[PDB]
Structure formats: C-alpha cells, structure tokens
Design a protein around this motif. Sequence first.
Motif, PDB file in Angstrom:
ATOM      1  N   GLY C 238     -17.727  16.314  16.539  1.00 30.98           N
ATOM      2  CA  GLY C 238     -16.720  16.905  16.109  1.00 30.98           C
ATOM      3  C   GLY C 238     -15.737  15.706  15.331  1.00 30.98           C
ATOM      4  N   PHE C 255     -15.284  21.671  30.066  1.00 30.38           N
ATOM      5  CA  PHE C 255     -14.916  22.126  28.939  1.00 30.38           C
ATOM      6  C   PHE C 255     -14.023  23.338  28.868  1.00 30.38           C
ATOM      7  N   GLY C 256     -12.843  23.095  28.195  1.00 31.53           N
ATOM      8  CA  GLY C 256     -11.864  24.123  28.027  1.00 31.53           C
ATOM      9  C   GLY C 256     -11.965  24.822  26.547  1.00 31.53           C
ATOM     10  N   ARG C 257     -11.842  26.111  26.686  1.00 30.47           N
ATOM     11  CA  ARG C 257     -12.060  26.882  25.271  1.00 30.47           C
ATOM     12  C   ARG C 257     -10.727  27.609  24.923  1.00 30.47           C
ATOM     13  N   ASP C 258     -10.691  27.735  23.469  1.00 29.64           N
ATOM     14  CA  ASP C 258      -9.543  28.375  22.897  1.00 29.64           C
ATOM     15  C   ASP C 258      -9.695  29.965  22.870  1.00 29.64           C
ATOM     16  N   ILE C 259      -9.015  30.390  21.946  1.00 28.55           N
ATOM     17  CA  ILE C 259      -9.512  31.825  21.338  1.00 28.55           C
ATOM     18  C   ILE C 259     -10.737  31.811  20.803  1.00 28.55           C
ATOM     19  N   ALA C 260     -10.929  31.087  19.906  1.00 25.00           N
ATOM     20  CA  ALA C 260     -12.221  31.240  19.145  1.00 25.00           C
ATOM     21  C   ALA C 260     -13.345  30.602  19.879  1.00 25.00           C
ATOM     22  N   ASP C 261     -14.637  30.882  19.384  1.00 27.01           N
ATOM     23  CA  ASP C 261     -15.730  30.393  20.015  1.00 27.01           C
ATOM     24  C   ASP C 261     -16.064  28.796  19.732  1.00 27.01           C
ATOM     25  N   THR C 262     -15.110  28.080  20.272  1.00 25.25           N
ATOM     26  CA  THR C 262     -15.064  26.631  20.018  1.00 25.25           C
ATOM     27  C   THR C 262     -14.642  25.838  21.339  1.00 25.25           C
ATOM     28  N   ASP C 264     -11.740  23.590  23.176  1.00 21.69           N
ATOM     29  CA  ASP C 264     -10.337  23.342  22.877  1.00 21.69           C
ATOM     30  C   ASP C 264      -9.933  21.705  23.661  1.00 21.69           C
TER      31      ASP C 264
END
Lengths: 138, 49, 371, 99, 129, 230, 98, 49, 111
Positions: C238, C255-262, C264
């Motif tokens: 990235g 790994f931490g994840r946001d609203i979308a599928d990616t 954060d």
Amino acid sequence: YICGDSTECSNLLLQYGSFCTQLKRALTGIAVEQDKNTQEVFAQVKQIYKTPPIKYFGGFNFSQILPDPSKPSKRSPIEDLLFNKVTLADAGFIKQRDLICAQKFKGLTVLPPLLTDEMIAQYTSALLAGTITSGWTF
Amino acid sequence: YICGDSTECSNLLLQYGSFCTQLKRALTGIAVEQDKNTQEVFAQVKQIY
Amino acid sequence: TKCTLKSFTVEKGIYQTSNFRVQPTESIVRFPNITNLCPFDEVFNATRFASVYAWNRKRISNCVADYSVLYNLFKCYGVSPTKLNDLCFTNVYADSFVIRGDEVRQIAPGQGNIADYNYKLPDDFTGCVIAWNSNKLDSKVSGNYNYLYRLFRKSNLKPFERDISTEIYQAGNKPCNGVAGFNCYFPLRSYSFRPQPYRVVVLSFELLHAPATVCGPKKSTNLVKNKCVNFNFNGLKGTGVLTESNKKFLPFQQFGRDIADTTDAVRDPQTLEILDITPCSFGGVSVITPGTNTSNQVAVLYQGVNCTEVPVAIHADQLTPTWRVYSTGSNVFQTRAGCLIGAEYVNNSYECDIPIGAGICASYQTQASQS
Amino acid sequence: ADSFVIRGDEVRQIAPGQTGNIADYNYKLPDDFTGCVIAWNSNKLDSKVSGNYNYLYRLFRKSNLKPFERDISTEIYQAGNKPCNGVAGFNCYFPLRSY
Amino acid sequence: QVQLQESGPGLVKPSETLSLTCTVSGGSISSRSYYWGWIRQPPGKGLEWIGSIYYSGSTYYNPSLKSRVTISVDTSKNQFSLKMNSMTAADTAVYYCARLRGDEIYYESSGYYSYFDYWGQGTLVTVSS
Amino acid sequence: NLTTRTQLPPAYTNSFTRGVYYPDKVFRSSVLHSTQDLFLPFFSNVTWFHDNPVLPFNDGVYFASIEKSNIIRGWIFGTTLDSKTQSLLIVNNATNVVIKVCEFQFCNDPFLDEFRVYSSANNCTFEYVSQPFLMDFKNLREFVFKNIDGYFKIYSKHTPILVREPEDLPQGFSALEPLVDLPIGINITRFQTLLAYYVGYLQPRTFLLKYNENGTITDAVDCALDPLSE
Amino acid sequence: LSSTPSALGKLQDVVNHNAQALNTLVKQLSSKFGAISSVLNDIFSRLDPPEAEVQIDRLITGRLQSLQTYVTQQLIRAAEIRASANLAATKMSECVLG
Amino acid sequence: PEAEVQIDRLITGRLQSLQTYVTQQLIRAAEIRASANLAATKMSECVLG
Amino acid sequence: QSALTQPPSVSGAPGQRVAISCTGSSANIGTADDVHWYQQLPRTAPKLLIYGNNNRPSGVPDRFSGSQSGTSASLVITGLQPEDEADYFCQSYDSSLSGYVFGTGTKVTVL
C-alpha cells in the motif's frame, strides 16, 4: 474510489477514459447549482440594511428575530436555535477514533459553500432591517 | 425478479452488496411521496364541511 | 486547463483540471528480523516416501523459503510461481506423496484416483507443487508393497481424512462382508510399473494467521513515520503515512479494519507497535484564470489540504515529492476551500468575480501592476 | 519466424508469465504477443539416443529475460549464497544442458 | 528433580557481545515442549519480565526489550539462549531462566495466559562499569 | 470403572439474551456489526439437568453450569466412545486441567469423586495440562464448544450470581470471551460430562453486535428472533 | 421549535440523504460483484494478469456502476433541491419583499 | 466455473434493468411531484380564494 | 497496563495472620484470571508460590493461600513461619500489551 491508489489499477481506467471526467463535470455542475440556489434565495438586496440603535417600533418586539450582537455568531435567538436543532454532517473544512468523515480516505470529499453562515445571517439581517424600517419599498 | 421462486441466490445477490436496499429505499420514498402529494392537494381543510 | 477544455483560448473562471496527489518518498518493507534459511535439501531429495493413499507431513516450519532454487529437481496453484517469493505467512504444511503416470493429474484441486478414497488433497489449495518424474532414476517394477491403488469405495472422504481399511465396500443392492456380488469388490491392488515410482513434493501455505514467522528473501528496511511511504507489512502492500494508532489491540490481533473491506491498522512485525494505515493527503486541483484574452497568469487552488501538505517550495519540486509534474506560484494563502497558491490576499472587500469557497473570491485587479 | 529446437517436456512453455527450463532461462514471449507458436516432433530428423550437441539450452540464469532477447554466455552460475570461486561445487552449476 | 543450569559472563563494558545459555539438568519435566522466559532483576529492585518464547515462535518482548535484542531455543540440545549485545547502562542485573507451565504434544495451540514455575539460580551481569 | 446411577427425565428452561461469543479475532470497536455465524437462538429452549446423560453435539453446543462449588469437573467429546475412534477428554483436576485427544475406552458412567472416567488411553496424540478452565448456588459458568474443520474453539465466562435456584437462568447480557483454540483434527458428534446443568444448541443465525469503545460486546440483537429485531 | 424535535425535518432529511448516499457508496465498496475478492491488492498479489485482469475488470465495472448510480441520484436530488430553492426565492420575493 | 460466469452476466443484465426502471420512476416521480405542487397551488389560489 | 499498587512492608510477628494484597486495573486482574504470587528469599530464586488467583502448586502448605476477588488480589497467611520471611511479588496477564507486569514487592520483616 475505484482503485487503491497504490497500484497500476489506474492504468485500466484509461480503457474506459471519458467516464470519470463526466462525473467530475456533473458533480461540479451540481456544486455550482447549489451555490447559485443559495445566491438566488438570500441575495435579494444589493444593500446591507441596519436597524436603528433605538429598537422601538411602536410596541412590536423584534428582539427574537433581529441579530443578537452579544453573541459571536451574530444571529437571532431563533437562528441560534435553528442551527442547534440540525445535526449537521458536512466536512467543508481543512482540519483533519474515526468518525463518519473517514470516508474522505476513499476519495469522497465535501466542498464548503461559497456563502458562509455569517454571510447568510447578514443577508437575513439586511432583509429584516429593510422590511421593518421601510416596508415593501426597499 | 432476479433469481426467482426458489432458486438459491443467497450466494449470488449477496456478492453485489446492498444494491436492492437502494432500490427498496428509493421505491419506498416514491410511494411516500405520492401519498404526500395526495395529502397536500386534497387535505387543505381543517374541517369537513 | 487548455488541454482539459480542448481549446487554445480559455474563458474567465475557475476550472477543475486534475487531482493533487502525493508520491511515496521512501519505499519501505517490514519483515520480522529472521536470519534463518530453508533447508531445501531435505525437501527436494529423499529416498523413502509415504503411500499414495496414506501420505504424511514433513512440515518445514519457521524456515525462510527461496523459490529461485525450485529447478534443481511446475504446476502451481493459488499463487502464480513468479510471486510466491514476496508472500508472508506462518507455517508451511508439507503434503508430499507418490503417484502413477495415469495419476499425474488426479491428485489436484480439480481433477480421480485412490486419493479421492483414502487421503485427499483439498480443492481450496493455496500451495505450490513440484512434479518430479523419477522413472529414469529409480528403475524398478514394484514401487513398494505399501504403495497400492484402488478404483472405488462406497463413499468418498474429506481432505486429510484417513481411512485405509482393507474390506469389501458396497455400491450395489446388498451389504457384503467378505462376499463377492453386484458392486461388492475389493479393488485394492499394489503397483507394478513397466518401462518406476513417481514423486510429488507439495508445500501447502496456510491462511488466518498469527504474526508471521516466515517471509521471502526480500531484505527488510527501516520504519518511516509521518511521511507518505510505499509500505509492505508481511505481504500487505500500500501507500500512506504511518502514525501511531492508540488502539486497544489484543496481543493475538495483527490487523485492524475500518468500515470498508480494507485494513485500517497493522501491527509492526519487529517492534510490535500498532500503526495506522492512513493514505497521504490529496485534493482536487482548481485553476483560477482571468482568461487568456486578458492574461496568462493563473492561480491554483489545491482543494481541502493544508498549506504544509502542498508543494510550496517550487524550486525544490524537481525531486518529485508529489504526483503533480510541475509546481508554480508565488504567494501562499490558507482558505477553508483549500490552500490557494498564486493569489495575494488583500483586506479590501470587492464583489465576487471568480468564486473559490467559504467567502473568498479571486479577481485580476490593479495594485501599479496587474496581478 | 524465429525458430529453435527445444525438448519435449516444455512444448507449451513458450508463453508470457511462465517458469520453466526454456521459459525463464533462455527465451521469453511478450505479454502483448499476437501470432502463433508452432511445434512438431522431429524424430524423422533428430532421433538420437545420445544428445545432439548443436542444440542446447541453459538451466540457470542470473537476470530475468526480456521478450525476443538472445542471451549467450559460458559463465558458471552460482546457486547458493556461498561463493563458487571458479570451480563448480555444491549449488554451483554450469547452466548449459542438452537432450 | 527439575533444575535449570545457567551460564554467562558477568562483566562487560557498554557496547560489548555476550550471551546467556540456559540448560536443562536432565529432568523430562521442563525439558522440551514447554513455554519459556527470562526474568531480569536489578540489585535493590524487584522482578520484571523481559523475554518469553511460545512453542517454535510466537515471541513476546518487554517494551524495553522490544527491538533491543533477540532470543533463541535450540530444542534438541535443550539450549535456551538469550543474546546480550551492546546493552544500555540499566541492564546491570541478575537474570533468571524460567519455564512457564504447560506440556503440549505434536501441534501449535493457542492459550491466552502465562506462568513462571521453575527458576534458575540467577546470573549477575554488570554493564555500568 | 463402571458404576450404576439413577436416570431422570429432562427439564427445559429459557435462554433469554444469553449465549453470544466473539465470532472473529478482528478487534472492532464502537460499531454495529452484522454477522452470519453460529449462535444460540434467543429465547430458546435450553435443556436443563440436575445425572450424566450422553447428549449429541449438533454443530456447536452452548453449555452452562450453576453450582455452589466444583462439581462438574469436565467434558467428553467424540463420535463413538469405545476403542475404535479418537476422542477428546477435558478434566479439571483441582489444581490443573488435563486435555487429551487419544483413542480411549470409557465406562458407561464416567465421574470424578478418584478417577473412573475411562480404562485405557492408547495412542495419545494430543495432551495439554495447564491452568484449570473452571473459576471462582452462586457460581455460573458459561462455555461454547464450536467444532470447525480443524479447530475446537472453547469460549468461556465466569459470573457470581444471586438468583432463585430453580428455573432462573438469569436475564441480561454477557459476551463470552475466547478461552482456548485446540488444533485437533477429530470428528465430534456427541458429548458427555463428568461429575444445575444447561445445554443449548447453536444454529447458523444472523446477529447484530454492538462494539463499544473498549471493543467489548454489550448488546446483541437477533433479526430472526422478532420483526422489531429484524 | 424547541418542543418538537421533528419540526426541522425537511432539512435533516437533506443532510441524512446526503450522508446516507455517501455511506451507501462506502459500504458498496466492500462488495465483490462476483469476483473472488473485493481487495485489489489481494488479486494482484495472488493471481496472474490474464486472470487478475478479468477479476479486477469485474470489480472496476462494479465501482463504475456504483459511481454512475450515485451521480444519477445526486442529479435527481439536485433537481428537487433546485425546485425547492426556486420556491424559497419566490416566497422570499413575494412574502418578505411585499 | 462456467455456470456462475453466465449467471453473473444474466444477474448483471437484470439488475441493470431494475436500475433503469428505478431511475425512470424517480424522474417520473419528480414530474408528478411538480404537477402535484402545481395542483395544490391551484387548489389554494383558485378554490380557497 | 499494570497499575499494580502493593504495600512495601508489613509486620510479620510469628504465629499471627498477615494479609497482603496487590490491586491492578480491570484488564488483567479484574478479568479474574492468571495472577501469580511469588516468594523470594534473599539470595534465592523466586519460586512460584501460588497461581490461578488461589490455586496452590505441589509442596505449598495449608492455611497459606489467596483470596482474590475482582480487581484486588490478596494472600492470607495464618501462622507465619520463620522460613516465610521473604519478598512477595505479583504477576498478571494483560490483554492490551501482555507486558507480564510485576509488583514492587512486600518484604515481610519478623519481630
């Protein structure tokens, strides 16, 4: 929004070509149309009118609709009440746990309006001062 | 409309996301809008004379 | 503006022409500081192997693989063989066995032998296999007395399910216990080659990981913070800035994840802190011109950014820190619409000529020269 | 009409994005290739038990191939991290092979 | 009969190379398939944890020792090595090899707790000199 | 050792808003997450026992025990409980827990007094002796046993309660934190316990989970349960 | 206005429709459209370009359709807001100025 | 691996048909909204006065 | 991460009950899981003395145990022995960092 911006995915949007520019033109037209809407509604006068410093109008009390100079927003008590009853979700500012406005990182930004809240309040103040001190003549 | 009466499409339409939610909210807004239209046109009296 | 409008003359106004983006400056990669190497001699070369119907696992774990030494002894699934060398994971599952020439394509994620009946290779297979043809070296008739083939059972098995029972199974109309009849057969027969066993080495690569123990041969670099960098955290590529998260990660979480599928946030593989994945600053570019009939002097609005995230020092932007190929301007002013470069801010109020945003407008006026 | 003589194990490896004895060491086909690759059996002309030592290929390379690139070398390839020091030993090979 | 033998020199200058080895005295308990750790205790201070290893990998480190130096286990020789390379001035302390708890067979489990049960005698190292 | 006991008819009780665990290892916070996973249905019928009957394992089992002290000391998992297939045994022996995957050969009524759970433990393939899973009729213990292909996931919670002793599995909400992730490759279709007692069965349902600022679940809604919840 | 929180609903619906359209556009990014993964970086890191190309072409056509849908709803809502603003300007001129 | 290749095609076509229908219903709903606003204005200004 | 408050010393008159305690945050001890107390005689290895918030290992006698409940953990020692004059440490497993935090120690002195 389409590609992750760390990649050669953007080299295949050239295969479609004129589509993203068509959205950027369309959203620009929408934004200019919204600024035109605000300009047509509130800029009905070419002069900024003021009330006299003695607010006596034959017994009619306009203090709840005239702007309050003791507050920094320069708005009426009714206008100060109206801005507090709208949970506004714009992001028209430079300032950068996360809120709903973390959608900026996906390429979705919010443009600030041409007229700020203070200028719309001053247009409203000019309209009120005109319709109190001069009737329909202004 | 898309898959049918008993065609298993839960592995199919769920791959495209919340798209029919947008259609359902749009058509619901249209329906409420015509009810509001009839309400604004005809219900302009406070009493039945 | 001329190439966007497709014209050699530009009318007066503000025009959205391109997008302001920031280059990654350092290209960093973060792997755990491991100095081990994979003992591939035990992998490629061996003399005794387990059966086609009950094979075993010689798991090469915590050993840094290199795939340039693959052709010292092919078919590859999940990941194309040009880029297994940059993946990162935790464990390598070995799934090696022996085959026949009429079974070279039947032990596969797709295509039909005894492996479908007694011990099976998964269809969801994320590893890479090695096809070694050993008739010309191990020249013999019988491969082993423990290497046997069959045709069918009454039921198939799951992948890595072991059932090697020597009994007649029934696909007919009656049960059979040592009885021959309609679909009552015991087809388990041993191999007898003609001009010689064949051998396949399988290295299955796992998912759903702990913090990674094994990586590729890429040399890890230093961690760069608060700048737009091109990063790679254990295969996660990235571009963005790497600030401290202040997030309450549990120690098994990577790994931490946001609203979308990616992703954060990511845990650093070496110093074990938690770093936010925030993409570096961007905005639209608006070009403010009075018209080429009047002048060629323009002012540029970089929408929604600060004046510290924008190229201001135009004399040092030939080193390309930004995706903008040029950098012009003299006066820099901060507006809520964005950082405006090219227009000198004055304290006199005029009628709005070219709108910018948040009460600020631009015009081409006399100050005595034109600007 | 570029022509050469390969082994039978890698007929289908004249293609972009392939790894193999001739795919990643000696000859590479471009990704934007338009045309055709033709292969035939040469046992009516070259049926030999021993190798034909006028038609060889390299089993190892030091740098990745370019499409339509010739690469002729008599160098000795080092496979391991230990230096070869001239004489080929363990994980050091002369790359040229034959049928 | 569970005893832990420790070895390592005791006096270096700053920016020097040293290593502590921890060996199992011969008991099958606390020999091979256990979790392991090192404990550092300054003279006049209390205990504080620095190192821990879980099965083959899965190493957790103290914030002082996060990227400071690495740890290793040779399982076959029952050797538990903690490297000590270029230590800072606060590492003058007594070091203890310690087994946590938990026998485990043939796999790689996932437990969400930790221990220290058996302890070595403790070796003193001096770095502020 | 096989010992004779007395068989009793079962009871049934309510589940209330109880039986929600963490579905994934990804730490979500301050959100509302929609998930499609194995859960205990809300307001279901949880089977209530006071003996040790042999019960099925219908793809994940919620287990609960309300007791004053340490009485139910572990569990038994397998397909058949003779020396034919492999099986799993969990014993909370006073100061430790012993978890074994072996071939085993049990009696008809395994129980703890002494140890009469089984008779042989041939071909042991997994063993784990550690901190006992049981902690602190005031004590309530919740577990979720979820057998995914490759893994046996045990989720746990311990709670001091003060309620009425019969028919009063208490209302309220408590998320079940993950306890252990056993890497066992065995089939599990049936389970038994070692000697209140509550067994409910999981089903693939759709839940809405509320993740607070600390990453802890504090509310769970089932759309399937009621139209308002939908 | 203080006693009734739903008095200002005509403006709050505009704010909620804009935020809801943007949030729908964000949740719509977390969709696969029939591809094997919604992450471009995963498809580039696991698949070769003759197959990664058709997978990302599926995803890119999904994002194209999503953006065209969003701009079509924004044009329709902008026409509605333009009609409401023309009515507001007419009411300003005929109620306030006379 | 050929079935859902064709099913993706046919779902995409039918979903585009639904999107076309919903878009044209929104445009017609805006037209009927303008006509109903005109009808309510005519009712208030012609009937009520 | 730790928040471990522990008294530095306490009166250790023999044959008399001594209660010591350490209190942390609601992430390691308040989860009611994995808090250990260690006994350290001077110039002697600090052996594991009690674990599992009250669970006693092999060799540790009776009337000498733990009474943890919630955020605060505590040992009771009824009938202090002359061989129990030592330093007592805590250790708890936190989930945010897993820094394996220790206490300052309670050095008991007999009189």
